[PDB]
Design a protein around this nucleic acid. Sequence first.
RNA 1: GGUUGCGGCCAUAUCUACCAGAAAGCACCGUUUCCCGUCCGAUCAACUGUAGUUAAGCUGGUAAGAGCCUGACCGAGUAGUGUAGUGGGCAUACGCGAAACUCAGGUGCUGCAAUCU
RNA 2: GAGAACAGAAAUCUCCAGUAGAACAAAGGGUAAAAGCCCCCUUGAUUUUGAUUUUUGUGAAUACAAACCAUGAAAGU
Lengths: 59, 124, 168, 243
Amino acid sequence: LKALKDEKEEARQAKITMLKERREKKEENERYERLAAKMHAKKVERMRRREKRNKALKE
Amino acid sequence: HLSTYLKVYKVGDIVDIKANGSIQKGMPHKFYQGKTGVVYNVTKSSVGVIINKMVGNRYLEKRLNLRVEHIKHSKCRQEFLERVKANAAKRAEAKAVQLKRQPAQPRESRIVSTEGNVPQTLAP
Amino acid sequence: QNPMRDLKIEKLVLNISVGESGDRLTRASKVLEQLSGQTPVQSKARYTVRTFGIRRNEKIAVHVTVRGPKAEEILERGLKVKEYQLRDRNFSATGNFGFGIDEHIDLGIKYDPSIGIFGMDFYVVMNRPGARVTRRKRCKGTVGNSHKTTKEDTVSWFKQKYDADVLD
Amino acid sequence: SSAYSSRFQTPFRRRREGKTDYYQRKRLVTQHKAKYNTPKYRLVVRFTNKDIICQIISSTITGDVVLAAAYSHELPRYGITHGLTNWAAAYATGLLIARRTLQKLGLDFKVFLDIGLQRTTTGARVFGALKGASDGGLYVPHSENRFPGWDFETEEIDPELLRSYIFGGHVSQYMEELADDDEERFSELFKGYLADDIDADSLEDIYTSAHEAIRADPAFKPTEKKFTKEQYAAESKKYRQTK
RNA sequence: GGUUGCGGCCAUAUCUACCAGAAAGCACCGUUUCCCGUCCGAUCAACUGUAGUUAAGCUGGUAAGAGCCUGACCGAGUAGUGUAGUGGGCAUACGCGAAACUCAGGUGCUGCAAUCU
RNA sequence: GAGAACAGAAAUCUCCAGUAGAACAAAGGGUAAAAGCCCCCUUGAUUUUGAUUUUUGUGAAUACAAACCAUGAAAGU
């Protein structure tokens, strides 16, 4: 019994680990892209602050 | 969608009202949506449609004009006409029946074989 | 190999951004007009700034565009002022390049204190045959990657004709 | 990116290529529709390099149909090898397709011009084809505004000027000027014309030629079609990829 | 079978990267007296297809790619839900019955006319 | 985003990306060779005859024909 259940659960754990590895690679590069975009956005809104720019009227 | 303009609509045809958001002109009738009415007259720009609207407990008759963009041909009577034509054919064949419809009947006797399909016994 | 994939000059735009609007603009007007032969275009201000000392719709610059042999002729007579020595920069990513000159009198035109002195910015756009696909109306499209101009190709074309240097 | 691609909404294929304008197309094809079938006919003129196209189209949910179609490559049969894309050549093609359609309907009807994407300018070859067709006798609605020689400074027109344009007067006077001023550009731009040694009165007579010829036989003498279907197909499949 | 023109359905067609395209055409491309319009024959207008090019565009294949579409004895007869009971302290009985996700597969199909080794 | 003398985060110029993230009387629908900006011409925001929906009172919008008109080469509006 201990022989049988451990190869079956081991194969299933292999499937689990492949799923997890894949999802984490994808979300990792996604997170890197979003983080660089966030930093770029922060840097541009840093210099836009020097502009007076009442956003309302039309100037 | 240009196929919504090469669409002849003759007096008598039945059509559903389904107004699309893409044309601000003639957006009709908030609750006349998914409601069916036959066409009474047609002009340019235009089609007539009549609907039996109920108020109280009587069906009064509301006639209306709509742009062709919102209306749509109804497939309401497809099986009706198919069955009528098939009934004409079957009546001709009889003249040479139960052409009426019938609900689902109880399935009749039969034989089930065991050639390669031996029954597989099992449990919870 | 390059039978049609060459790197001709398309056009040069000469621009004069003035701190003030008026007869100064008209004089810069006249300068670019006499340099090109044709009539230039007056550009207004987009919005008010109040630190550069201007306002909306103030006619604060004048510029002109030139195509043909005239363009590269004027380009060479202007680059004589910069004596054929640009920088690693002054070359865009997409394969264009420009510079700026003070004392416009350093190409042929004399002092003439009648009017004064102006500086101007040259900018020069490069391409090959086949740019019409992104400029016409019918049939509009875009150009492939292999045929795209680039800083490297332009810099090589420039270390070639005009026989210049990069200076860093 | 993924989200931008997903939220993207593609236009129609014929629009993604710069080929049609549905804004104009619906105003054309859409009928009164109180009258029910009444197919609306439109003459479609198109200019490519080296060739002209003039067709007459009805459109339907099958997608459309071509009852009559002519091109400028037919005019060599009618008496002109040269200048197929010019104003007079498109005028001739329009007269050709008009007499053709009028022959097939047997009358000697009402067709609406399609401009395409070409700009509406005074002295355009689309209006030359218009004048050819109206020549032919099909009633198309139009105004005398856009024919060439329309003095923009007022509301008048000189018929002799567009008569000269029909006969090829601008090309002829440019030939004369470039000839008596130079021969480099002349030999470059007029090699076939130079080998032929054609005149101004000459070329007007040739266009009259071709006019009477299309009035004689507009019945579409078709091409000879050498090397029938399977030859073309197999030889093209030699160079067609496959998965 | 290839291509051009007009279209229908509107990503199975779109995006990204690379490659191939005899012939046909299409396209870049050559010129600016006139019709015309441009700050600027770059666009638009006109002329000859002559000087010349498949480089580009366009067409087609390719990617354990993105997306888009289809299907699933995929999820699952699960969740949820209508009815009954002196059933327990939520199951049972007769019934109805999903979706997301996951997995797999695919990557434009066509109408009219003309034309090509 | 890259790039150009004075000129910098914002003055003017050029190129690339950019399904709308802009504008159309502030988190929303609809609109991209436009329903947006600029340009050309006009002022149909005009009279007569009836029809429909909202609504018995009107008004509002809606389509519908005849005329005078504008517009575009035209379809047509």
